[PDB]
Structures are given as structure tokens and as C-alpha cells.
Amino acid sequence: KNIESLFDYSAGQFEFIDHLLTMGVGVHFAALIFFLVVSQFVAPKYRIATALSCIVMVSAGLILNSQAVMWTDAYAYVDGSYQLQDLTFSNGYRYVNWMATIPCLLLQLLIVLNLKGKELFSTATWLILAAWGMIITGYVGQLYEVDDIAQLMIWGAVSTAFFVVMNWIVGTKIFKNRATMLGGTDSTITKVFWLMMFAWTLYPIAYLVPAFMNNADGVVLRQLLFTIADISSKVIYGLMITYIAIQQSAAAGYVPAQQALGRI
Numbered sequence: 001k002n003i004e005s006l007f008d009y010s011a012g013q014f015e016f017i018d019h020l021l022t023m024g025v026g027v028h029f030a031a032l033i034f035f036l037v038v039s040q041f042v043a044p045k046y047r048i049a050t051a052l053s054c055i056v057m058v059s060a061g062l063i064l065n066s067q068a069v070m071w072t073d074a075y076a077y078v079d080g081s082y083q084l085q086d087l088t089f090s091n092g093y094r095y096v097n098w099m100a101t102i103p104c105l106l107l108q109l110l111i112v113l114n115l116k117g118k119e120l121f122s123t124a125t126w127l128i129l130a131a132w133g134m135i136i137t138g139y140v141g142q143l144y145e146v147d148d149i150a151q152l153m154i155w156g157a158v159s160t161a162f163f164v165v166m167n168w169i170v171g172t173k174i175f176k177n178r179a180t181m182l183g184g185t186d187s188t189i190t191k192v193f194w195l196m197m198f199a200w201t202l203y204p205i206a207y208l209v210p211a212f213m214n215n216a217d218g219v220v221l222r223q224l225l226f227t228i229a230d231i232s233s234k235v236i237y238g239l240m241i242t243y244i245a246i247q248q249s250a251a252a253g254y255v256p257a258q259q260a261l262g263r264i
């Protein structure tokens with residue numbers, strides 16, 4: 001049902017996808033340890049933001065590790081190339097977590113934006129329904145990434161509609177709550193928004209490879225496209241969200257944040 005199952009892979013393509021995925025686990029899980037140790041320097045009101053990154057980290061990494069083992073389970077070197085065996089590989093598992101890490105990333109965004117109470121809950125609900133819409137329509141579309149390209153685009157189209165609306169909610173909330181943010185992070189939060197827009201656009205592009213490059217190299221380009229999109233939407237966005245939390249913590253009087261920031 002997926003383009004990965006259509007081709008045999010050179011040893012170079014197979015080894016490179018395996019190393020991509022394994023490199024991914026390493027980063028997600030090495031970042032994991034960073035978000036853990038620095039959480040003590042984050043004020044109570046922001047510490048959930050760092051913790052959500054830990055959840056994102058382990059959510060992504062467990063998936064990535066699962067994909068790497070499934071990659072090696074599904075193919076074997078036969079007659080000079082890596083060929084599909086009795087198990088299959090697919091990316092659909094990667095949408096399911098997206099269902100999960102995105103609430104979390106939106107939520108740590110909203111926390112450092114100093115949203116609170118009912119506006120936090122009402123904003124989070126709308127975002128999660130809209131991010132969820134993007135993901136699930138997108139997921140139905142790549143189900144047809146072999147059998148029905150026309151239904152690829154239409155679902156991709158529907159998902160893309162959801163995408164635009166979420167980034168409208170996210171954008172509106174950043175620029176209206178820019179003013180509440182402490183220690184100069186009002187300048188920082190706008191870079192975050194643009195960082196997010198870059199790596200979140202990488203995924204549709206990845207989604208569309210079967211339509212414009214339906215061959216084994218396009219299978220590689222996806223997994224490459226996925227790796228950058230993830231490193232940036234999870235790991236780098238995490239780190240940036242964390243610097244904001246610590247900086248606002250220091251500006252709010254949290255002495256462990258003032259000391260950690262001063263230590264460097």
C-alpha cells in the first residue's frame with residue numbers, strides 16, 4: 001500500500017536509511033537527558049514545558065527505534081540487493097505519534113506564552129482538534145500513495161487546509177501574547193514561530209515524494225526529509241522552548257534560573 005514496498009534497495013540506500021533512523025534515536029534520547037537535567041532550573045510555572053519535551057523526545061525516539069528495527073526485519077540481502085521479506089515497513093506508525101507529540105509541542109508553546117486558565121484550555125483544545133485534523137486526513141491520503149495518487153492530493157489538500165488554520169491560531173497567539181513575555185523572550189518567540197513553519201512544511205513535501213519521485217531514491221528522500229523535519233520540530237524546537245522557559249524564570253525571580261544562566 002506504500003511505495004517503500006515496491007522496490008529492492010541497493011546496500012547503500014538500505015544502510016543509509018538504517019543510519020538515518022538510528023542517528024535519530026540517538027539525538028532524541030540524548031536530548032532527552034538534557035531536558036531532564038535542566039528542568040531543575042525552570043520555575044514552577046514553566047517546568048511542564050521542559051517535561052513535555054521529555055515526552056516528545058521519548059515519543060519520537062521510540063517510534064524511530066521501532067522504524068529502524070522494522071526496516072531491518074522487513075528486508076534481507078538477496079541476490080545482490082535488499083529485498084522485501086515476510087514483514088513490511090511503513091510510515092503510518094509515524095503519523096500516530098504525530099497525533100501525540102503535537103498537542104505536547106503546541107502545549108509547551110502555549111505554556112511559555114504565559115497562557116493560563118480558560119484561554120490556555122480553550123486554545124489547546126482548538127489546536128489539538130485542528131492539528132488532529134491535519135494528521136488524520138494526511139494519514140488517510142498516504143494510504144493511497146500507491147493505489148490512488150488522485151486521493152493522495154485531495155487528502156493532502158484537506159490536511160493542508162487544516163495546517164493553515166492551526167498556524168493561524170498559533171501565529172495569532174504568539175503575536176498577541178508577545179507582550180507578556182519576560183527577559184527579552186518576546187523577540188525569541190517570533191523566531192520559534194518561523195522555525196516551526198520551516199520544519200512543518202518539510203513533512204508535506206515528504207508526503208508528496210511518491211507523486212514526484214516514485215522510486216527507491218525518493219524512498220530515501222522522505223526518510224531524509226523526515227529526519228530534518230523531526231530533528232527541528234522536536235529536538236531544536238524543544239531546546240528553543242527551554243531557553244525561553246529558563247530566561248523567563250530568571251526574569252521572574254527564580255533563583256536557580258538566575259544562577260544557571262549566570263554560570264554560562
Ligand SMILES: *C\C=C(C)/C=C/C=C(C)/C=C/C1=C(C)CCCC1(C)C
Pocket residue numbers: 098101102105134135137138139155156157159160163200201203204207230233234
Ligand atoms: C512531530 C512533530 C510535528 C509538528 C509534525 C508535524 C507534521 C506535519 C505538520 C505534517 C502535515 C501534513 C500536511 C500539512 C499535509 C499532508 C499530510 C501531512 C500530515 C504530511
Ligand SMILES: CCCCCCCC/C=C\CCCCCCCC(=O)O
Pocket residue numbers: 012013016227228231
Ligand atoms: C539539521 C538536520 C540534520 C540532518 C542530518 C542528516 C544526515 C545526512 C547527511 C548528508 C547525507 C549525504 C550523503 C549521501 C547519501 C548517499 C545515498 C546513497 O548511498 O545512495
Ligand SMILES: CCCCCCCC/C=C\CCCCCCCC(=O)O
Pocket residue numbers: 022023024025026027030031034239
Ligand atoms: C545513536 C546515534 C549515534 C550518535 C550518538 C548520539 C550523539 C548525540 C549528538 C549531539 C546531541 C546534541 C543535542 C543537544 C544536547 C543538549 C545540549 C545542548 O546542545 O544544548
Ligand SMILES: [Cl-]
Pocket residue numbers: 043044045046
Ligand atoms: Cl513559578
Ligand SMILES: [Cl-]
Pocket residue numbers: 056059060061063097098101
Ligand atoms: Cl513523535
